Write a protein that binds this ligand. Structure first.
Ligand SMILES: [Fe+3]
Ligand SMILES: [Fe+3]
Lengths: 264, 272
Protein backbone atom coordinates (compact mmCIF):
# COMPACT_ATOMS: atom_id res chain seq x y z
CA UNK A 1 0.00 0.00 0.00
CA UNK A 2 1.24 3.49 0.97
CA UNK A 3 1.05 5.50 4.19
CA UNK A 4 -0.03 9.04 3.50
CA UNK A 5 0.39 12.14 5.70
CA UNK A 6 -1.52 15.45 5.54
CA UNK A 7 0.57 18.39 4.38
CA UNK A 8 0.50 20.99 7.18
CA UNK A 9 -1.04 24.32 6.07
CA UNK A 10 1.11 27.34 6.99
CA UNK A 11 -0.11 30.01 9.34
CA UNK A 12 -2.48 31.39 6.48
CA UNK A 13 -3.81 27.90 5.59
CA UNK A 14 -1.64 27.74 2.45
CA UNK A 15 -0.24 24.44 1.16
CA UNK A 16 2.62 24.33 -1.27
CA UNK A 17 1.71 21.62 -3.74
CA UNK A 18 4.40 20.45 -6.15
CA UNK A 19 4.20 20.45 -9.96
CA UNK A 20 4.10 16.64 -9.76
CA UNK A 21 1.13 16.77 -7.31
CA UNK A 22 -0.72 19.23 -9.60
CA UNK A 23 -0.10 16.96 -12.60
CA UNK A 24 -1.66 14.06 -10.65
CA UNK A 25 -4.73 16.23 -9.89
CA UNK A 26 -4.89 17.25 -13.59
CA UNK A 27 -4.80 13.63 -14.76
CA UNK A 28 -7.45 12.55 -12.21
CA UNK A 29 -9.69 15.50 -13.09
CA UNK A 30 -9.44 15.21 -16.88
CA UNK A 31 -10.01 11.43 -16.87
CA UNK A 32 -13.04 11.74 -14.55
CA UNK A 33 -14.84 14.75 -16.11
CA UNK A 34 -14.87 12.68 -19.27
CA UNK A 35 -16.17 9.62 -17.33
CA UNK A 36 -19.16 11.50 -15.72
CA UNK A 37 -20.60 14.08 -18.20
CA UNK A 38 -23.72 11.92 -18.73
CA UNK A 39 -23.46 9.84 -15.56
CA UNK A 40 -23.17 12.25 -12.62
CA UNK A 41 -26.54 13.68 -11.58
CA UNK A 42 -27.68 17.19 -12.57
CA UNK A 43 -27.29 18.36 -8.96
CA UNK A 44 -23.62 17.35 -8.98
CA UNK A 45 -22.96 19.19 -12.26
CA UNK A 46 -24.60 22.29 -10.80
CA UNK A 47 -22.29 21.92 -7.84
CA UNK A 48 -19.25 21.78 -10.15
CA UNK A 49 -20.47 25.02 -11.78
CA UNK A 50 -20.68 26.65 -8.34
CA UNK A 51 -17.16 25.45 -7.27
CA UNK A 52 -15.44 26.20 -10.60
CA UNK A 53 -12.53 24.00 -9.55
CA UNK A 54 -9.10 24.39 -11.27
CA UNK A 55 -8.52 21.59 -13.78
CA UNK A 56 -4.71 21.79 -13.62
CA UNK A 57 -3.77 22.26 -9.97
CA UNK A 58 -4.94 21.33 -6.53
CA UNK A 59 -7.16 24.11 -5.11
CA UNK A 60 -6.40 25.66 -1.74
CA UNK A 61 -9.02 24.61 0.80
CA UNK A 62 -9.95 28.33 1.26
CA UNK A 63 -10.97 28.56 -2.41
CA UNK A 64 -13.41 25.66 -1.90
CA UNK A 65 -14.63 26.87 1.49
CA UNK A 66 -15.41 30.37 0.15
CA UNK A 67 -17.94 28.78 -2.19
CA UNK A 68 -19.30 26.24 0.38
CA UNK A 69 -19.82 29.13 2.86
CA UNK A 70 -21.81 31.18 0.32
CA UNK A 71 -23.90 28.27 -0.85
CA UNK A 72 -24.76 26.34 2.35
CA UNK A 73 -22.66 27.72 5.21
CA UNK A 74 -20.20 24.75 4.99
CA UNK A 75 -16.40 24.78 4.91
CA UNK A 76 -13.57 22.38 4.16
CA UNK A 77 -11.72 21.53 7.37
CA UNK A 78 -8.10 20.27 7.16
CA UNK A 79 -7.53 17.10 9.16
CA UNK A 80 -4.80 14.46 9.56
CA UNK A 81 -4.85 11.49 7.14
CA UNK A 82 -6.70 9.37 9.67
CA UNK A 83 -9.34 10.65 12.09
CA UNK A 84 -11.73 8.77 14.40
CA UNK A 85 -15.52 8.45 14.27
CA UNK A 86 -15.93 10.92 17.13
CA UNK A 87 -14.13 13.68 15.25
CA UNK A 88 -15.87 12.82 11.95
CA UNK A 89 -19.47 13.07 13.31
CA UNK A 90 -18.59 16.16 15.31
CA UNK A 91 -17.12 18.06 12.36
CA UNK A 92 -19.99 17.17 10.10
CA UNK A 93 -22.52 18.21 12.76
CA UNK A 94 -20.79 21.66 12.74
CA UNK A 95 -20.89 21.89 8.89
CA UNK A 96 -17.10 21.28 8.67
CA UNK A 97 -16.19 18.74 5.99
CA UNK A 98 -12.98 16.93 6.87
CA UNK A 99 -10.31 16.97 4.17
CA UNK A 100 -6.92 15.22 4.52
CA UNK A 101 -4.38 17.29 2.65
CA UNK A 102 -2.50 14.74 0.58
CA UNK A 103 -2.81 13.38 -2.95
CA UNK A 104 -2.31 9.74 -4.03
CA UNK A 105 0.94 8.32 -5.41
CA UNK A 106 1.41 7.56 -9.10
CA UNK A 107 1.40 3.89 -8.22
CA UNK A 108 -2.09 4.30 -6.65
CA UNK A 109 -3.56 6.42 -9.44
CA UNK A 110 -6.40 3.99 -10.25
CA UNK A 111 -7.38 3.11 -6.67
CA UNK A 112 -6.58 3.80 -3.05
CA UNK A 113 -8.50 2.95 0.08
CA UNK A 114 -7.74 6.29 1.82
CA UNK A 115 -9.75 9.33 0.83
CA UNK A 116 -7.26 11.79 -0.75
CA UNK A 117 -7.81 15.40 -1.68
CA UNK A 118 -9.10 14.59 -5.20
CA UNK A 119 -11.64 12.14 -3.73
CA UNK A 120 -12.86 14.68 -1.17
CA UNK A 121 -12.90 17.85 -3.32
CA UNK A 122 -13.94 16.41 -6.67
CA UNK A 123 -16.07 13.59 -5.27
CA UNK A 124 -17.93 15.09 -2.33
CA UNK A 125 -17.55 18.89 -2.27
CA UNK A 126 -19.69 19.69 -5.34
CA UNK A 127 -22.80 18.34 -3.62
CA UNK A 128 -22.00 20.21 -0.39
CA UNK A 129 -23.08 23.34 -2.32
CA UNK A 130 -26.56 21.76 -2.65
CA UNK A 131 -28.85 22.69 0.21
CA UNK A 132 -30.60 19.31 0.43
CA UNK A 133 -27.38 17.32 0.39
CA UNK A 134 -25.51 19.68 2.78
CA UNK A 135 -28.41 19.84 5.28
CA UNK A 136 -28.64 16.00 5.15
CA UNK A 137 -24.89 15.71 5.83
CA UNK A 138 -25.20 18.12 8.77
CA UNK A 139 -28.13 16.00 10.12
CA UNK A 140 -25.99 12.88 9.64
CA UNK A 141 -23.26 14.38 11.82
CA UNK A 142 -25.83 15.16 14.51
CA UNK A 143 -27.12 11.55 14.40
CA UNK A 144 -23.75 10.21 15.47
CA UNK A 145 -22.96 12.59 18.39
CA UNK A 146 -24.48 10.50 21.12
CA UNK A 147 -24.44 7.17 19.34
CA UNK A 148 -23.17 3.98 20.93
CA UNK A 149 -20.66 1.78 19.13
CA UNK A 150 -23.47 -0.42 17.76
CA UNK A 151 -25.49 2.58 16.62
CA UNK A 152 -22.48 4.08 14.82
CA UNK A 153 -22.14 0.90 12.68
CA UNK A 154 -25.78 1.32 11.39
CA UNK A 155 -25.12 5.02 10.81
CA UNK A 156 -21.90 4.24 8.76
CA UNK A 157 -24.09 1.98 6.62
CA UNK A 158 -26.59 4.79 5.90
CA UNK A 159 -23.57 6.98 5.00
CA UNK A 160 -22.07 4.28 2.74
CA UNK A 161 -25.28 3.81 0.68
CA UNK A 162 -25.97 7.57 0.35
CA UNK A 163 -23.02 9.97 0.56
CA UNK A 164 -20.46 7.39 -0.71
CA UNK A 165 -22.38 5.06 -3.14
CA UNK A 166 -25.70 6.71 -3.78
CA UNK A 167 -27.43 6.55 -7.16
CA UNK A 168 -30.51 8.22 -8.65
CA UNK A 169 -33.36 6.81 -10.76
CA UNK A 170 -34.06 9.97 -12.79
CA UNK A 171 -36.40 10.70 -15.67
CA UNK A 172 -33.32 10.83 -17.98
CA UNK A 173 -31.90 7.55 -16.64
CA UNK A 174 -29.65 6.23 -13.95
CA UNK A 175 -27.30 8.80 -12.44
CA UNK A 176 -24.72 9.05 -9.65
CA UNK A 177 -24.52 11.20 -6.48
CA UNK A 178 -22.22 9.13 -4.28
CA UNK A 179 -18.70 10.60 -4.02
CA UNK A 180 -17.05 7.15 -3.89
CA UNK A 181 -18.43 6.53 -7.33
CA UNK A 182 -17.96 10.07 -8.73
CA UNK A 183 -14.19 10.27 -8.10
CA UNK A 184 -13.31 6.81 -9.61
CA UNK A 185 -13.35 5.57 -13.22
CA UNK A 186 -13.58 1.92 -12.00
CA UNK A 187 -16.45 2.67 -9.64
CA UNK A 188 -18.33 4.85 -12.22
CA UNK A 189 -18.21 2.20 -14.92
CA UNK A 190 -19.34 -0.58 -12.63
CA UNK A 191 -22.17 1.38 -10.92
CA UNK A 192 -23.55 2.56 -14.29
CA UNK A 193 -22.98 -0.47 -16.50
CA UNK A 194 -22.62 -3.72 -14.58
CA UNK A 195 -25.32 -6.02 -15.80
CA UNK A 196 -26.00 -8.15 -12.71
CA UNK A 197 -25.62 -5.81 -9.79
CA UNK A 198 -28.77 -5.08 -7.68
CA UNK A 199 -29.97 -1.46 -7.90
CA UNK A 200 -32.85 -1.06 -5.42
CA UNK A 201 -35.18 1.87 -4.57
CA UNK A 202 -33.95 3.65 -1.44
CA UNK A 203 -35.68 2.54 1.79
CA UNK A 204 -34.08 3.63 5.03
CA UNK A 205 -34.84 0.40 6.97
CA UNK A 206 -33.56 -1.77 4.08
CA UNK A 207 -30.40 0.38 3.95
CA UNK A 208 -29.77 0.10 7.69
CA UNK A 209 -30.07 -3.70 7.44
CA UNK A 210 -27.74 -4.14 4.43
CA UNK A 211 -24.28 -5.61 5.17
CA UNK A 212 -21.41 -4.28 3.06
CA UNK A 213 -17.65 -4.67 2.57
CA UNK A 214 -15.38 -1.87 1.56
CA UNK A 215 -12.90 -3.75 -0.61
CA UNK A 216 -15.25 -5.52 -2.97
CA UNK A 217 -17.32 -4.48 -5.99
CA UNK A 218 -20.59 -3.53 -4.41
CA UNK A 219 -23.38 -6.06 -5.04
CA UNK A 220 -26.14 -3.62 -4.04
CA UNK A 221 -26.81 0.08 -4.62
CA UNK A 222 -29.75 2.17 -3.47
CA UNK A 223 -31.45 4.78 -5.72
CA UNK A 224 -33.23 7.99 -4.69
CA UNK A 225 -35.23 9.72 -7.46
CA UNK A 226 -33.50 13.05 -6.83
CA UNK A 227 -31.04 14.51 -4.32
CA UNK A 228 -33.83 16.44 -2.55
CA UNK A 229 -35.29 13.06 -1.51
CA UNK A 230 -32.71 13.25 1.26
CA UNK A 231 -34.92 15.95 2.89
CA UNK A 232 -37.11 13.15 4.25
CA UNK A 233 -34.27 11.66 6.35
CA UNK A 234 -32.91 15.12 7.07
CA UNK A 235 -36.27 15.95 8.71
CA UNK A 236 -36.31 13.06 11.19
CA UNK A 237 -35.37 13.90 14.79
CA UNK A 238 -32.30 12.07 16.09
CA UNK A 239 -34.71 10.06 18.34
CA UNK A 240 -36.60 8.94 15.18
CA UNK A 241 -33.33 7.88 13.53
CA UNK A 242 -32.36 5.89 16.65
CA UNK A 243 -35.80 4.17 16.66
CA UNK A 244 -35.09 3.11 13.03
CA UNK A 245 -31.62 1.93 14.11
CA UNK A 246 -33.26 -0.01 16.99
CA UNK A 247 -35.68 -1.54 14.46
CA UNK A 248 -32.77 -2.71 12.25
CA UNK A 249 -30.86 -4.08 15.17
CA UNK A 250 -33.86 -5.92 16.55
CA UNK A 251 -34.61 -7.43 13.10
CA UNK A 252 -30.91 -8.22 12.49
CA UNK A 253 -29.21 -7.70 9.15
CA UNK A 254 -30.62 -8.80 5.85
CA UNK A 255 -28.98 -12.00 4.58
CA UNK A 256 -25.65 -10.95 3.00
CA UNK A 257 -25.19 -11.18 -0.79
CA UNK A 258 -22.73 -13.96 -1.67
CA UNK A 259 -19.74 -11.54 -2.32
CA UNK A 260 -20.23 -10.11 1.13
CA UNK A 261 -20.18 -13.60 2.70
CA UNK A 262 -16.93 -14.24 0.87
CA UNK A 263 -14.98 -11.05 1.76
CA UNK A 264 -12.19 -11.31 4.37
CA UNK B 1 -18.16 -28.78 17.13
CA UNK B 2 -15.72 -28.65 14.18
CA UNK B 3 -14.28 -25.24 15.27
CA UNK B 4 -11.11 -25.06 17.45
CA UNK B 5 -10.80 -28.92 17.45
CA UNK B 6 -10.87 -30.49 13.94
CA UNK B 7 -11.34 -34.32 13.98
CA UNK B 8 -8.55 -36.90 14.36
CA UNK B 9 -9.23 -40.39 12.95
CA UNK B 10 -9.19 -43.20 15.59
CA UNK B 11 -6.65 -46.00 15.38
CA UNK B 12 -8.72 -47.61 12.57
CA UNK B 13 -9.00 -44.31 10.65
CA UNK B 14 -12.67 -43.89 11.56
CA UNK B 15 -14.12 -40.44 12.22
CA UNK B 16 -17.24 -40.06 14.30
CA UNK B 17 -19.43 -37.41 12.76
CA UNK B 18 -22.40 -36.06 14.67
CA UNK B 19 -26.00 -36.23 13.44
CA UNK B 20 -25.74 -32.41 12.99
CA UNK B 21 -22.51 -32.71 10.94
CA UNK B 22 -24.18 -35.38 8.75
CA UNK B 23 -27.22 -33.15 8.30
CA UNK B 24 -24.91 -30.28 7.17
CA UNK B 25 -23.35 -32.66 4.58
CA UNK B 26 -26.81 -33.72 3.38
CA UNK B 27 -27.95 -30.12 2.91
CA UNK B 28 -24.72 -29.18 1.08
CA UNK B 29 -24.94 -32.27 -1.17
CA UNK B 30 -28.62 -31.98 -2.04
CA UNK B 31 -28.36 -28.25 -2.87
CA UNK B 32 -25.24 -28.75 -5.00
CA UNK B 33 -26.50 -31.79 -6.94
CA UNK B 34 -29.31 -29.55 -8.09
CA UNK B 35 -26.93 -26.56 -8.86
CA UNK B 36 -24.59 -28.52 -11.11
CA UNK B 37 -27.02 -30.65 -13.12
CA UNK B 38 -26.11 -29.30 -16.67
CA UNK B 39 -23.16 -27.17 -15.44
CA UNK B 40 -20.55 -29.56 -14.07
CA UNK B 41 -18.62 -31.14 -16.99
CA UNK B 42 -19.36 -34.68 -18.13
CA UNK B 43 -16.01 -35.88 -16.71
CA UNK B 44 -17.11 -34.76 -13.25
CA UNK B 45 -20.51 -36.53 -13.53
CA UNK B 46 -18.68 -39.71 -14.61
CA UNK B 47 -16.53 -39.36 -11.46
CA UNK B 48 -19.64 -39.02 -9.26
CA UNK B 49 -20.97 -42.31 -10.73
CA UNK B 50 -17.62 -43.96 -9.81
CA UNK B 51 -17.54 -42.61 -6.20
CA UNK B 52 -21.19 -43.31 -5.34
CA UNK B 53 -20.96 -40.81 -2.47
CA UNK B 54 -23.57 -41.04 0.31
CA UNK B 55 -26.14 -38.25 0.13
CA UNK B 56 -27.06 -38.20 3.85
CA UNK B 57 -23.84 -38.60 5.83
CA UNK B 58 -20.17 -37.68 5.63
CA UNK B 59 -18.26 -40.59 4.00
CA UNK B 60 -15.28 -42.15 5.74
CA UNK B 61 -12.05 -41.20 3.92
CA UNK B 62 -11.43 -44.93 3.21
CA UNK B 63 -14.68 -45.22 1.28
CA UNK B 64 -13.49 -42.55 -1.08
CA UNK B 65 -9.80 -43.65 -1.12
CA UNK B 66 -10.74 -47.21 -2.07
CA UNK B 67 -12.31 -45.93 -5.29
CA UNK B 68 -9.54 -43.41 -6.04
CA UNK B 69 -7.03 -46.29 -5.54
CA UNK B 70 -8.66 -48.50 -8.17
CA UNK B 71 -9.34 -45.72 -10.69
CA UNK B 72 -6.10 -43.70 -10.66
CA UNK B 73 -3.94 -44.81 -7.71
CA UNK B 74 -4.87 -41.79 -5.61
CA UNK B 75 -6.03 -41.65 -1.96
CA UNK B 76 -7.52 -39.06 0.40
CA UNK B 77 -5.05 -38.06 3.07
CA UNK B 78 -6.42 -36.70 6.38
CA UNK B 79 -4.90 -33.47 7.72
CA UNK B 80 -6.10 -32.21 11.11
CA UNK B 81 -4.41 -28.80 10.80
CA UNK B 82 -3.61 -26.55 7.14
CA UNK B 83 -0.14 -27.86 6.09
CA UNK B 84 2.78 -25.94 4.45
CA UNK B 85 3.36 -25.56 0.70
CA UNK B 86 6.30 -27.99 0.86
CA UNK B 87 4.16 -30.72 2.35
CA UNK B 88 1.24 -29.98 0.00
CA UNK B 89 3.48 -30.49 -3.06
CA UNK B 90 5.02 -33.63 -1.50
CA UNK B 91 1.58 -35.16 -0.84
CA UNK B 92 0.28 -34.50 -4.37
CA UNK B 93 3.54 -35.86 -5.82
CA UNK B 94 2.74 -39.08 -3.92
CA UNK B 95 -0.92 -39.17 -5.18
CA UNK B 96 -2.17 -38.23 -1.71
CA UNK B 97 -4.86 -35.51 -1.75
CA UNK B 98 -4.96 -33.65 1.55
CA UNK B 99 -8.49 -33.44 3.11
CA UNK B 100 -9.08 -31.35 6.24
CA UNK B 101 -11.06 -33.41 8.77
CA UNK B 102 -13.87 -30.97 9.59
CA UNK B 103 -17.18 -29.73 8.14
CA UNK B 104 -18.35 -26.09 8.17
CA UNK B 105 -20.79 -24.86 10.88
CA UNK B 106 -24.46 -24.19 10.03
CA UNK B 107 -23.73 -20.48 10.19
CA UNK B 108 -21.11 -20.86 7.40
CA UNK B 109 -23.27 -23.11 5.15
CA UNK B 110 -23.10 -20.84 2.10
CA UNK B 111 -19.37 -19.99 2.31
CA UNK B 112 -16.15 -20.50 4.26
CA UNK B 113 -12.63 -19.54 3.37
CA UNK B 114 -10.87 -22.66 4.74
CA UNK B 115 -11.52 -25.72 2.50
CA UNK B 116 -13.64 -28.27 4.39
CA UNK B 117 -14.40 -31.95 3.85
CA UNK B 118 -17.36 -31.11 1.60
CA UNK B 119 -15.26 -28.84 -0.66
CA UNK B 120 -12.58 -31.54 -1.06
CA UNK B 121 -14.72 -34.66 -1.42
CA UNK B 122 -17.58 -33.16 -3.42
CA UNK B 123 -15.55 -30.53 -5.30
CA UNK B 124 -12.29 -32.40 -6.17
CA UNK B 125 -12.50 -36.12 -5.49
CA UNK B 126 -14.87 -37.03 -8.35
CA UNK B 127 -12.30 -35.70 -10.84
CA UNK B 128 -9.47 -37.57 -9.12
CA UNK B 129 -11.07 -40.74 -10.58
CA UNK B 130 -10.36 -39.25 -14.05
CA UNK B 131 -6.93 -40.20 -15.42
CA UNK B 132 -6.21 -36.87 -17.14
CA UNK B 133 -7.18 -34.78 -14.09
CA UNK B 134 -5.40 -37.13 -11.59
CA UNK B 135 -2.18 -37.31 -13.65
CA UNK B 136 -2.14 -33.50 -14.01
CA UNK B 137 -2.55 -33.12 -10.24
CA UNK B 138 0.33 -35.51 -9.61
CA UNK B 139 2.52 -33.65 -12.15
CA UNK B 140 1.58 -30.35 -10.48
CA UNK B 141 2.78 -31.75 -7.15
CA UNK B 142 6.07 -32.78 -8.79
CA UNK B 143 6.49 -29.24 -10.24
CA UNK B 144 6.61 -27.67 -6.75
CA UNK B 145 9.01 -30.08 -4.99
CA UNK B 146 12.13 -28.04 -5.76
CA UNK B 147 10.43 -24.75 -6.58
CA UNK B 148 11.61 -21.49 -5.07
CA UNK B 149 9.25 -19.27 -3.06
CA UNK B 150 8.48 -17.13 -6.11
CA UNK B 151 8.12 -20.15 -8.40
CA UNK B 152 5.60 -21.65 -5.95
CA UNK B 153 3.52 -18.34 -6.23
CA UNK B 154 3.30 -18.94 -10.01
CA UNK B 155 2.44 -22.59 -9.50
CA UNK B 156 -0.38 -21.68 -7.04
CA UNK B 157 -1.73 -19.26 -9.70
CA UNK B 158 -1.77 -22.10 -12.25
CA UNK B 159 -3.59 -24.35 -9.72
CA UNK B 160 -6.09 -21.56 -8.99
CA UNK B 161 -7.08 -21.16 -12.60
CA UNK B 162 -7.34 -24.95 -13.31
CA UNK B 163 -8.04 -27.20 -10.31
CA UNK B 164 -9.87 -24.51 -8.30
CA UNK B 165 -11.66 -22.30 -10.91
CA UNK B 166 -11.31 -24.07 -14.25
CA UNK B 167 -14.06 -23.95 -16.81
CA UNK B 168 -14.70 -25.76 -20.10
CA UNK B 169 -15.90 -24.28 -23.38
CA UNK B 170 -17.83 -27.18 -24.90
CA UNK B 171 -20.04 -27.65 -27.96
CA UNK B 172 -22.92 -28.05 -25.45
CA UNK B 173 -22.06 -24.75 -23.70
CA UNK B 174 -20.00 -23.65 -20.69
CA UNK B 175 -19.15 -26.32 -18.10
CA UNK B 176 -17.18 -26.50 -14.87
CA UNK B 177 -14.21 -28.56 -13.73
CA UNK B 178 -12.78 -26.35 -10.93
CA UNK B 179 -13.56 -27.65 -7.40
CA UNK B 180 -13.93 -24.16 -5.88
CA UNK B 181 -16.86 -23.63 -8.28
CA UNK B 182 -18.33 -27.20 -8.11
CA UNK B 183 -18.75 -27.20 -4.35
CA UNK B 184 -20.49 -23.78 -4.11
CA UNK B 185 -23.93 -22.63 -5.34
CA UNK B 186 -22.77 -18.96 -5.30
CA UNK B 187 -19.64 -19.75 -7.33
CA UNK B 188 -21.52 -21.99 -9.77
CA UNK B 189 -24.21 -19.39 -10.53
CA UNK B 190 -21.66 -16.59 -11.02
CA UNK B 191 -19.28 -18.70 -13.19
CA UNK B 192 -22.12 -19.85 -15.46
CA UNK B 193 -24.34 -16.80 -15.55
CA UNK B 194 -22.58 -13.54 -14.71
CA UNK B 195 -22.43 -11.72 -17.97
CA UNK B 196 -19.60 -9.18 -17.37
CA UNK B 197 -16.79 -11.51 -16.27
CA UNK B 198 -13.91 -12.26 -18.65
CA UNK B 199 -13.94 -15.94 -19.74
CA UNK B 200 -10.72 -16.50 -21.77
CA UNK B 201 -9.36 -19.51 -23.66
CA UNK B 202 -6.71 -21.31 -21.60
CA UNK B 203 -3.12 -20.22 -22.37
CA UNK B 204 -0.47 -21.13 -19.87
CA UNK B 205 1.56 -17.92 -20.26
CA UNK B 206 -1.60 -15.74 -19.86
CA UNK B 207 -2.52 -17.81 -16.75
CA UNK B 208 0.94 -17.50 -15.13
CA UNK B 209 0.76 -13.68 -15.69
CA UNK B 210 -2.73 -13.12 -14.17
CA UNK B 211 -2.92 -11.47 -10.68
CA UNK B 212 -5.77 -12.83 -8.59
CA UNK B 213 -7.29 -12.48 -5.11
CA UNK B 214 -8.98 -15.27 -3.22
CA UNK B 215 -11.62 -13.21 -1.39
CA UNK B 216 -13.36 -11.60 -4.40
CA UNK B 217 -15.73 -12.65 -7.23
CA UNK B 218 -13.26 -13.67 -9.92
CA UNK B 219 -12.99 -11.14 -12.79
CA UNK B 220 -11.32 -13.69 -15.09
CA UNK B 221 -11.72 -17.44 -15.81
CA UNK B 222 -9.73 -19.67 -18.15
CA UNK B 223 -11.41 -22.30 -20.30
CA UNK B 224 -10.16 -25.63 -21.62
CA UNK B 225 -12.31 -27.50 -24.16
CA UNK B 226 -12.15 -30.87 -22.30
CA UNK B 227 -10.48 -32.07 -19.08
CA UNK B 228 -8.06 -34.13 -21.16
CA UNK B 229 -6.60 -30.78 -22.34
CA UNK B 230 -4.66 -30.93 -19.07
CA UNK B 231 -2.54 -33.66 -20.71
CA UNK B 232 -0.56 -30.90 -22.52
CA UNK B 233 0.55 -29.33 -19.22
CA UNK B 234 1.09 -32.69 -17.49
CA UNK B 235 3.48 -33.69 -20.26
CA UNK B 236 5.93 -30.79 -19.71
CA UNK B 237 9.13 -31.47 -17.86
CA UNK B 238 9.55 -29.42 -14.64
CA UNK B 239 12.32 -27.44 -16.38
CA UNK B 240 9.80 -26.54 -19.15
CA UNK B 241 7.38 -25.22 -16.52
CA UNK B 242 10.13 -23.11 -14.88
CA UNK B 243 11.10 -21.74 -18.34
CA UNK B 244 7.45 -20.56 -18.69
CA UNK B 245 7.63 -18.95 -15.22
CA UNK B 246 10.82 -17.09 -16.23
CA UNK B 247 9.12 -15.94 -19.47
CA UNK B 248 6.16 -14.66 -17.43
CA UNK B 249 8.53 -12.77 -15.14
CA UNK B 250 10.41 -11.24 -18.11
CA UNK B 251 7.04 -9.92 -19.41
CA UNK B 252 5.77 -9.00 -15.94
CA UNK B 253 2.29 -9.61 -14.61
CA UNK B 254 -0.74 -8.55 -16.61
CA UNK B 255 -2.22 -5.28 -15.34
CA UNK B 256 -4.70 -6.18 -12.58
CA UNK B 257 -8.42 -5.82 -13.22
CA UNK B 258 -9.96 -3.05 -11.13
CA UNK B 259 -11.48 -5.52 -8.53
CA UNK B 260 -7.97 -6.92 -7.96
CA UNK B 261 -6.56 -3.43 -7.49
CA UNK B 262 -9.30 -2.75 -4.91
CA UNK B 263 -8.98 -6.04 -3.02
CA UNK B 264 -6.97 -6.37 0.15
CA UNK B 265 -3.33 -7.78 -0.52
CA UNK B 266 -3.29 -11.07 1.40
CA UNK B 267 -0.36 -13.36 2.24
CA UNK B 268 -1.24 -17.08 1.62
CA UNK B 269 0.70 -19.23 4.14
CA UNK B 270 -1.03 -22.42 2.91
CA UNK B 271 -1.81 -23.88 -0.49
CA UNK B 272 -5.31 -23.72 -2.10
FE1 LIG C 1 -15.78 9.58 0.49
FE1 LIG D 1 -9.99 -26.75 -3.60
Amino acid sequence: GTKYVSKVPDEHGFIEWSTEENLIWQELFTRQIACIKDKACDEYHEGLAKLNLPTDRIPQLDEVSKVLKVSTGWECYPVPALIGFGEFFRLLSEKKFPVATFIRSREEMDYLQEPDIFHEIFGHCPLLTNSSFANYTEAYGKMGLNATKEQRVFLARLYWFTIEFGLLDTPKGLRIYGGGVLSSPGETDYAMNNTDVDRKPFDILDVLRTPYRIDIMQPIYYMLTKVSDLDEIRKFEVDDIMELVAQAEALGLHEAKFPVKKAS
